[PDB]
DNA sequence: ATATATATATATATATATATATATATATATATATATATATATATATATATATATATATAT
DNA sequence: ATATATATATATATATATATATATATATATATATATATATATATATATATATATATATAT
């Protein structure tokens, strides 16, 4: 379909004139600011404390003072860092939240773009095709409701695994070549890293939904009993909004203690293997080593972020 | 021994799945979760085109360098053959080079690429595909293998 | 780690004047061009 | 015997003018960015000025 | 032992004055983009000329 094509131009004009990331990319000083921000958050576990961030930013400013054409300050690093950080918060690029600072989704996308723009390592690896093949293999074998097809698929899979077991019993096994392992490690890192990319879009979904709820209530005459069911209706509405729905299923899976613990153990043994150190620098390996911890804590943070809207029912209903 | 144990548990897992399926208790993806599970494979595989978009450019630049260098009067025939072999091997050594090489290795056992294409054809027929992807995205994924081969 | 914090800014600065995509995105008239091109290439995988 | 000369109309290529369309460079006009000045929010004071309540007195 | 009346210290609020950082309104320089002049390149229309396959007529 192509009827929307007329409207898409207006949509893109909107995005250009308002969206944070795009506006950032158009600034005369875009690369310097984006690089500074990238470096700042490149070391984060979670939201960084305001003063830790201030120190790091002031130090980084010192490193780039030689770029004098941009009116970069040359006599006061802490004041400059504070001014710039305040401005960036004004740019809707980072959040005045809980004494810490987090990367707005706009910053996430701008980082992904520019960091994926120059001459670099590509977004893929030689192992991507194998992963896609396995994923399609599972997607088809599970979408197919014909039980006959499913049982036949299992009959052949079990035979393949039986071949493998017999081969190993006879004393023959196979392992990855070094560079093959390098590519697989890079593939793992590329995949798992994307899991973090959308938490703070779900956060914004909750924020916008809650602000829309409170905004529509400007009809002070509204029969307040509606919220007795709207308490469930908001949850249902966001449980079909792909953000909240997918995040809820993600939590449902994230609660499988055995699977997450096993995946962490496997990640540990993978990072231990020598090839790991070659595929990734120490920073990336440290990031991946505790990844499960990061996901757990970020999900819990987003939960306690939606928490604000949860109590809003009584704040709306009651008076006295 | 560790591989043996892993396979011994995986075989038991799949045998349990077979027992359940034979019991008539086969299970499908929640028809609604199918939309997201298909969007997953689409987004995942969308990278490959963005990668060949650069494999092509790398090899083009290698060829242009070989041209502008072969002009060199200092170069003699033995220099030229050596430079050809070295340039091609070095290009193949870079990450994108290994991507290309793996894709090529897939072709030697085309059975797998054709099986993937057939499966994708089946997948996009299922009704949920229409919700996940418009006609354009389905048009791409249905012929991703062909678009790679051509590229 | 430290090396990158200084070398990377060069990569972005160069990309801001070397890579066509970023050069385009900063232009006054970017969305019109991007939309029109998308529409052209939307319907024909062959060119 | 078969082979030959020039002469014809045949299509094709070439020189030249017409306007147009494209490319390069200059100038003007426009918009982003950052600087400067004013005022306001924030912190501290030297001291006034104070309320509260304790520590505290009184009663039986 | 309880129940009230007792003088005052502790802690606190606040004030004009100072200063300092943040926010708003402005001006000027840099960069962008469009427009224009001019030159130059493209292609087309017209007519001339080139060369070609065959015609018409001749050779030993």
Written as six digits, the tokens of A108 are 């996430």
| Cβ pair A17, C40 in contact under 8 A | no
Across the interface, whether the CB atoms of C1 and A118 are under 8 A apart is answered no
Interface contact C31-A12, CB threshold 8 A? yes
- Residue with the two structure tokens 């993806």: B29
Burial class of A204 by CB neighbour count within 10 A (0 to 12, 13 to 18, 19+): middle
The dihedrals phi and psi of A305, each to the nearest 5 degrees, come to: -80, -50
Closest C-chain CA to A114 = C12
| A155 neighbourhood in chain B, CB within 8 Å | 18
Provide residues of A within 8 Å CB-CB of chain C. 2, 5, 8-9, 12-13, 15-16, 22, 25-26, 30-32, 34-35, 38-39, 60, 63-64, 114, 117-118, 283
- Best CA proximity match to C15, nearest among A23, A108, A110: A110
**Residue showing tokens 């996009």:** B124
Q: Closest residue of C to B139, CA-based?
A: C45
Distances (CA, A) of B23 to A143, A150, B27, B47: 18, 12, 11, 40
Mark residue A99 as left, alpha or beta (left: phi above 0; alpha: psi -120 to 50; beta: remaining): left
* CA–CA dist B138, A155 (Å, integer): 30
List the beta bridge partners of residue A94: A103
Question: Nearest CA to A298 among A47, A101, A93, A100?
Answer: A47
Does A71 contact strand D, using a CB cutoff of 7 Å? Answer: yes
Mutate to test the interface with B, among C45, C46, C47 (most CBs of B within 10 A): C45
Interface of C with A (CB under 8 A): 1, 4-6, 8-9, 11-16, 19, 21-22, 25-26, 30-32, 34-36, 38-39, 42-43
Token pair for A320: 């006295």
Asked how this structure was determined, the answer is cryo-EM
With a 7 Å cutoff on the CB, does A79 touch strand D? no
Cβ A28 to strand D below 7 Å: yes
Instruction: Spell out the SS3 assignment of chain A.
Output: CCCCHHHHHHHHHHHHHHCHHHHHHCCCCHHHHHHHHHHHHCCCCCCEEHHHHHHHHHHHHHHCCCCHHHCCCCCCHHHHHHHHHHHHHHCCCECCECCEECECHHHHHHHHHHHCCCCCCCCCCCCHHHHHHHHHHHHHHHHCCCHHHHHHHHHHHHHHHHHHHHHHHCCCCCCCCHHHHHHHHHHHHHHHHHHHHHHHHHHHHHHHHHHHHHHHCCCCCCCHHHHHHHHHHHHHHHCCCHHHHHHHHHHHHHCCHHHHHHHHHHHHHHHHCHHHHHHCCHHHHHHHHCHHHHHHHHHHHHHHHHHHHHCHHHHHHCCC
């Amino acid at each position: 379909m192509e009827e929307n094509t007329r409207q898409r131009t207006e949509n893109y004009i909107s995005a250009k004139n308002q969206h944070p990331a795009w506006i950032l990319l158009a600034t005369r000083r875009a690369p310097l600011v984006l690089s500074a921000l990238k470096t700042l958050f490149e070391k984060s576990h979670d939201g960084i404390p305001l003063e830790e961030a201030i120190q790091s930013l002031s130090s980084i400013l010192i490193e780039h003072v030689s770029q004098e054409q941009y009116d970069i300050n040359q006599d006061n690093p802490f004041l400059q860092a504070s001014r710039e950080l305040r401005e960036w918060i004004k740019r809707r690029l980072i959040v005045e939240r809980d004494g810490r600072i987090f990367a707005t989704d706009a910053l996430e996308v701008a980082i992904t773009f520019v960091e994926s723009l120059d001459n670099r390592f590509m977004t893929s690896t030689a192992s991507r095709l194998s992963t896609v093949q396995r994923e399609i293999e599972n997607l088809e074998t599970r979408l197919n409701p014909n039980p006959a097809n499913r049982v036949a698929t299992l009959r052949r899979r079990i035979s393949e695994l039986e071949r493998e077991l017999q081969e190993a019993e006879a004393g023959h096994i196979e392992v990855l070549e070094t560079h093959q392992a390098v590519e697989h490690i890079r593939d793992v890192y590329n995949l798992a890293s994307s899991l973090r990319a959308d938490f703070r879009r779900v956060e914004d979904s909750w924020r916008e939904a809650d602000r829309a709820l409170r905004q529509s209530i400007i009809g002070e005459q509204y029969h307040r009993g509606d919220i007795v069911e709207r308490l469930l209706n908001d949850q249902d509405a966001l449980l079909n909004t792909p953000e909240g729905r997918v995040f809820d299923s993600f939590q449902q899976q994230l609660r499988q203690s055995s699977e997450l613990k096993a995946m962490s153990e496997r990640l540990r043994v993978i990072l231990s293997h020598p090839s790991a150190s070659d595929a990734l620098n120490r920073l990336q390996r440290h990031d991946l080593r505790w990844l499960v911890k990061r996901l757990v804590d970020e999900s819990q943070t987003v939960l306690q972020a939606r928490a604000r809207s949860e109590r809003d029912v009584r704040g709306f209903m009651k008076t006295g």
